Design a protein around this ligand. Structure first.
Ligand SMILES: Nc1ncnc2c1ncn2[C@@H]1O[C@H](COP(=O)(O)OP(=O)(O)O)[C@@H](O)[C@H]1O
Ligand SMILES: [Zn+2]
Length: 248
Protein backbone atom coordinates (compact mmCIF):
# COMPACT_ATOMS: atom_id res chain seq x y z
CA UNK A 1 0.00 0.00 0.00
CA UNK A 2 3.00 2.28 0.68
CA UNK A 3 5.62 3.93 -1.58
CA UNK A 4 8.71 3.10 0.53
CA UNK A 5 11.24 0.30 -0.16
CA UNK A 6 10.23 -3.27 0.60
CA UNK A 7 9.23 -6.50 -1.11
CA UNK A 8 5.76 -7.47 -2.30
CA UNK A 9 3.82 -10.47 -1.12
CA UNK A 10 0.60 -12.32 -1.76
CA UNK A 11 -1.02 -12.56 1.65
CA UNK A 12 -3.51 -15.28 2.52
CA UNK A 13 -5.80 -15.25 5.54
CA UNK A 14 -7.98 -18.19 6.37
CA UNK A 15 -11.40 -17.43 7.84
CA UNK A 16 -12.81 -20.56 9.53
CA UNK A 17 -16.31 -19.11 9.96
CA UNK A 18 -16.86 -18.82 6.19
CA UNK A 19 -14.42 -21.65 5.52
CA UNK A 20 -12.61 -19.55 2.92
CA UNK A 21 -9.21 -18.11 2.21
CA UNK A 22 -8.98 -14.37 1.71
CA UNK A 23 -6.37 -13.31 -0.83
CA UNK A 24 -4.64 -9.96 -0.39
CA UNK A 25 -1.31 -8.30 -1.10
CA UNK A 26 1.13 -6.60 1.24
CA UNK A 27 4.54 -5.02 1.24
CA UNK A 28 7.04 -5.96 3.90
CA UNK A 29 10.63 -5.32 4.92
CA UNK A 30 12.33 -8.32 6.48
CA UNK A 31 15.64 -8.30 8.36
CA UNK A 32 18.42 -10.17 6.57
CA UNK A 33 19.28 -12.34 9.60
CA UNK A 34 16.92 -14.50 11.70
CA UNK A 35 16.41 -13.71 15.40
CA UNK A 36 15.53 -17.30 16.35
CA UNK A 37 15.32 -20.85 14.99
CA UNK A 38 13.26 -23.95 15.78
CA UNK A 39 13.59 -27.44 14.31
CA UNK A 40 12.62 -26.72 10.67
CA UNK A 41 12.21 -22.94 10.44
CA UNK A 42 13.90 -19.62 11.13
CA UNK A 43 12.09 -16.53 12.40
CA UNK A 44 12.77 -13.02 11.06
CA UNK A 45 11.77 -9.60 12.34
CA UNK A 46 9.68 -7.87 9.71
CA UNK A 47 7.96 -4.54 9.36
CA UNK A 48 4.74 -4.10 7.45
CA UNK A 49 4.61 -1.57 4.64
CA UNK A 50 0.86 -1.94 4.34
CA UNK A 51 -1.83 -4.32 3.15
CA UNK A 52 -3.73 -4.01 -0.14
CA UNK A 53 -5.81 -6.02 -2.57
CA UNK A 54 -4.61 -8.85 -4.81
CA UNK A 55 -6.17 -7.16 -7.91
CA UNK A 56 -2.80 -6.70 -9.72
CA UNK A 57 -1.86 -10.38 -9.29
CA UNK A 58 -4.53 -12.51 -11.05
CA UNK A 59 -4.83 -16.17 -10.01
CA UNK A 60 -4.46 -24.10 -8.18
CA UNK A 61 -4.05 -24.39 -4.39
CA UNK A 62 -6.05 -23.55 -2.44
CA UNK A 63 -8.69 -24.42 -5.08
CA UNK A 64 -10.94 -21.63 -6.42
CA UNK A 65 -13.97 -22.89 -4.44
CA UNK A 66 -12.02 -22.33 -1.18
CA UNK A 67 -11.22 -18.70 -1.96
CA UNK A 68 -13.48 -15.82 -1.08
CA UNK A 69 -14.37 -13.60 -4.09
CA UNK A 70 -14.46 -10.62 -1.67
CA UNK A 71 -11.58 -9.52 0.58
CA UNK A 72 -12.75 -6.14 1.99
CA UNK A 73 -12.76 -7.46 5.56
CA UNK A 74 -9.88 -9.32 7.19
CA UNK A 75 -7.73 -9.22 10.32
CA UNK A 76 -4.64 -8.44 8.24
CA UNK A 77 -5.66 -4.84 7.51
CA UNK A 78 -5.54 -3.92 11.22
CA UNK A 79 -2.99 -6.44 12.59
CA UNK A 80 -0.50 -5.88 9.75
CA UNK A 81 -1.09 -2.18 9.03
CA UNK A 82 1.90 -0.07 7.94
CA UNK A 83 4.53 0.17 10.67
CA UNK A 84 3.57 -3.10 12.41
CA UNK A 85 6.49 -5.18 13.59
CA UNK A 86 5.80 -8.86 13.08
CA UNK A 87 7.47 -12.20 12.53
CA UNK A 88 8.22 -14.06 9.29
CA UNK A 89 9.05 -17.76 9.32
CA UNK A 90 10.97 -19.49 6.54
CA UNK A 91 11.93 -23.14 6.19
CA UNK A 92 15.70 -23.45 6.62
CA UNK A 93 16.75 -25.54 3.59
CA UNK A 94 16.25 -28.74 5.60
CA UNK A 95 9.88 -31.69 3.03
CA UNK A 96 7.85 -28.49 2.65
CA UNK A 97 5.29 -28.16 -0.15
CA UNK A 98 2.81 -25.38 -1.06
CA UNK A 99 -0.04 -27.33 0.59
CA UNK A 100 1.85 -27.52 3.91
CA UNK A 101 2.09 -23.72 4.36
CA UNK A 102 -1.69 -23.46 3.98
CA UNK A 103 -2.36 -26.54 6.15
CA UNK A 104 -0.21 -25.09 8.93
CA UNK A 105 -1.85 -21.64 8.89
CA UNK A 106 -5.34 -23.13 8.70
CA UNK A 107 -4.35 -25.38 11.60
CA UNK A 108 -3.40 -22.36 13.73
CA UNK A 109 -6.74 -20.78 12.79
CA UNK A 110 -8.55 -23.92 13.96
CA UNK A 111 -6.59 -23.82 17.23
CA UNK A 112 -7.49 -20.17 17.53
CA UNK A 113 -11.21 -21.20 17.43
CA UNK A 114 -10.48 -23.77 20.15
CA UNK A 115 -8.89 -20.99 22.27
CA UNK A 116 -12.16 -19.01 22.02
CA UNK A 117 -14.24 -22.06 22.91
CA UNK A 118 -11.95 -22.68 25.89
CA UNK A 119 -12.24 -19.03 27.02
CA UNK A 120 -16.04 -19.24 26.93
CA UNK A 121 -15.86 -21.67 29.87
CA UNK A 122 -14.32 -18.75 31.81
CA UNK A 123 -11.12 -20.47 32.98
CA UNK A 124 -8.85 -18.70 35.52
CA UNK A 125 -6.48 -17.86 32.67
CA UNK A 126 -8.01 -17.02 29.28
CA UNK A 127 -5.94 -18.03 26.29
CA UNK A 128 -5.42 -16.89 22.69
CA UNK A 129 -3.66 -18.06 19.56
CA UNK A 130 -2.14 -15.47 17.29
CA UNK A 131 -3.33 -15.04 13.75
CA UNK A 132 -1.03 -16.60 11.19
CA UNK A 133 -0.98 -15.98 7.44
CA UNK A 134 0.63 -17.47 4.35
CA UNK A 135 2.73 -15.07 2.32
CA UNK A 136 3.97 -15.75 -1.22
CA UNK A 137 7.19 -13.81 -1.41
CA UNK A 138 6.67 -13.02 -5.10
CA UNK A 139 9.65 -10.64 -5.44
CA UNK A 140 12.08 -13.43 -4.52
CA UNK A 141 13.52 -15.70 -7.24
CA UNK A 142 11.67 -19.04 -7.52
CA UNK A 143 13.67 -25.63 -9.50
CA UNK A 144 10.56 -23.41 -9.05
CA UNK A 145 8.17 -22.65 -7.39
CA UNK A 146 7.63 -19.35 -5.53
CA UNK A 147 9.15 -18.70 -2.10
CA UNK A 148 6.51 -19.14 0.56
CA UNK A 149 6.60 -18.35 4.26
CA UNK A 150 4.17 -17.81 7.08
CA UNK A 151 3.89 -14.65 9.12
CA UNK A 152 2.36 -13.90 12.50
CA UNK A 153 2.34 -11.10 15.08
CA UNK A 154 5.39 -10.47 17.23
CA UNK A 155 5.24 -11.93 20.74
CA UNK A 156 6.91 -9.69 23.33
CA UNK A 157 8.31 -11.51 26.37
CA UNK A 158 9.87 -14.85 27.29
CA UNK A 159 8.82 -17.49 24.76
CA UNK A 160 8.10 -20.85 26.44
CA UNK A 161 7.09 -24.25 25.08
CA UNK A 162 4.66 -26.00 27.45
CA UNK A 163 4.19 -29.29 25.64
CA UNK A 164 5.50 -30.92 22.48
CA UNK A 165 3.60 -32.84 19.81
CA UNK A 166 4.84 -36.07 21.36
CA UNK A 167 4.16 -36.15 25.08
CA UNK A 168 6.77 -33.83 26.56
CA UNK A 169 5.49 -31.66 29.41
CA UNK A 170 8.02 -28.85 29.46
CA UNK A 171 6.73 -26.46 32.16
CA UNK A 172 4.75 -26.65 35.39
CA UNK A 173 1.92 -24.42 34.21
CA UNK A 174 -1.56 -25.94 34.37
CA UNK A 175 -3.56 -23.96 31.78
CA UNK A 176 -1.62 -25.22 28.67
CA UNK A 177 -2.06 -28.83 29.75
CA UNK A 178 -5.70 -28.34 30.67
CA UNK A 179 -6.28 -26.71 27.30
CA UNK A 180 -4.80 -29.74 25.50
CA UNK A 181 -7.01 -32.02 27.60
CA UNK A 182 -10.06 -29.76 26.95
CA UNK A 183 -9.61 -29.95 23.16
CA UNK A 184 -9.44 -33.74 23.34
CA UNK A 185 -12.52 -34.27 25.48
CA UNK A 186 -14.66 -31.52 23.96
CA UNK A 187 -13.85 -32.63 20.41
CA UNK A 188 -15.20 -36.08 21.38
CA UNK A 189 -11.66 -37.35 20.77
CA UNK A 190 -11.63 -36.20 17.14
CA UNK A 191 -8.54 -34.06 17.78
CA UNK A 192 -6.11 -32.67 20.31
CA UNK A 193 -4.16 -29.45 20.29
CA UNK A 194 -0.58 -29.83 21.55
CA UNK A 195 2.71 -27.96 20.96
CA UNK A 196 1.25 -25.29 23.27
CA UNK A 197 3.88 -22.57 23.22
CA UNK A 198 4.22 -18.80 23.22
CA UNK A 199 4.41 -15.94 25.69
CA UNK A 200 2.23 -16.24 28.75
CA UNK A 201 -1.17 -17.39 27.42
CA UNK A 202 -0.60 -15.90 23.97
CA UNK A 203 0.17 -18.95 21.87
CA UNK A 204 1.54 -19.74 18.42
CA UNK A 205 2.61 -22.69 16.24
CA UNK A 206 0.34 -25.30 17.83
CA UNK A 207 0.01 -28.83 16.42
CA UNK A 208 -3.10 -30.96 16.08
CA UNK A 209 -3.25 -34.75 16.22
CA UNK A 210 -6.26 -36.64 14.89
CA UNK A 211 -6.98 -40.38 15.19
CA UNK A 212 -6.86 -40.88 11.39
CA UNK A 213 -3.59 -38.94 11.10
CA UNK A 214 -4.96 -37.11 8.04
CA UNK A 215 -4.17 -33.47 7.35
CA UNK A 216 -2.85 -30.96 9.90
CA UNK A 217 0.69 -31.03 8.45
CA UNK A 218 3.58 -33.39 9.03
CA UNK A 219 3.38 -32.99 12.81
CA UNK A 220 0.10 -34.90 13.00
CA UNK A 221 1.22 -38.14 14.64
CA UNK A 222 -2.29 -39.63 14.78
CA UNK A 223 -3.22 -42.14 17.49
CA UNK A 224 0.42 -42.36 18.59
CA UNK A 225 0.50 -38.58 19.21
CA UNK A 226 -2.76 -38.70 21.15
CA UNK A 227 -1.71 -41.65 23.28
CA UNK A 228 1.67 -40.13 24.00
CA UNK A 229 -0.17 -37.09 25.38
CA UNK A 230 -2.35 -39.38 27.51
CA UNK A 231 0.69 -41.19 28.96
CA UNK A 232 2.20 -37.99 30.25
CA UNK A 233 -0.93 -35.95 31.20
CA UNK A 234 -1.71 -35.35 34.87
CA UNK A 235 -5.04 -33.60 35.41
CA UNK A 236 -4.79 -30.36 37.35
CA UNK A 237 -7.08 -27.78 38.92
CA UNK A 238 -7.93 -26.21 35.55
CA UNK A 239 -8.93 -29.66 34.21
CA UNK A 240 -11.10 -30.02 37.32
CA UNK A 241 -12.57 -26.52 36.95
CA UNK A 242 -13.51 -27.36 33.38
CA UNK A 243 -15.13 -30.59 34.66
CA UNK A 244 -12.96 -32.76 32.43
CA UNK A 245 -12.93 -36.53 32.89
CA UNK A 246 -9.83 -37.83 34.70
CA UNK A 247 -10.01 -40.78 32.27
CA UNK A 248 -8.52 -39.93 28.82
N1 LIG B 1 5.29 -14.75 17.15
C1 LIG B 1 6.54 -14.85 17.66
N2 LIG B 1 7.13 -13.81 18.29
C2 LIG B 1 8.38 -13.91 18.80
N3 LIG B 1 9.12 -15.01 18.74
C3 LIG B 1 8.66 -16.13 18.14
C4 LIG B 1 7.31 -16.11 17.55
N4 LIG B 1 7.08 -17.32 17.03
C5 LIG B 1 8.20 -18.06 17.25
N5 LIG B 1 9.15 -17.36 17.92
C6 LIG B 1 10.51 -17.87 18.29
O1 LIG B 1 11.05 -18.50 17.11
C7 LIG B 1 11.38 -19.87 17.36
C8 LIG B 1 11.19 -20.81 16.16
O2 LIG B 1 9.85 -20.92 15.68
P1 LIG B 1 9.07 -22.34 15.48
O3 LIG B 1 7.63 -21.93 15.25
O4 LIG B 1 9.37 -23.24 16.66
O5 LIG B 1 9.65 -23.07 14.13
P2 LIG B 1 9.59 -24.69 13.83
O6 LIG B 1 8.75 -24.88 12.60
O7 LIG B 1 11.01 -25.11 13.57
O8 LIG B 1 8.98 -25.29 15.07
C9 LIG B 1 10.58 -20.24 18.60
O9 LIG B 1 11.25 -21.24 19.35
C10 LIG B 1 10.53 -18.93 19.36
O10 LIG B 1 11.77 -18.79 20.06
ZN1 LIG C 1 -6.55 -33.06 32.41
Amino acid sequence: ISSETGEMGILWEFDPIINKWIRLSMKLKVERKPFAEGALREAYHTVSLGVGTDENYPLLFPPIEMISPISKNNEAMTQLKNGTKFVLKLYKKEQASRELYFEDVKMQMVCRDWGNKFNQKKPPKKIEFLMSWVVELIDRSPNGQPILCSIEPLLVGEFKKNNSNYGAVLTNRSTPQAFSHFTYELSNKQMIVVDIQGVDDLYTDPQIHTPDGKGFGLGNLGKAGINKFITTHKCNAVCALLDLDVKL
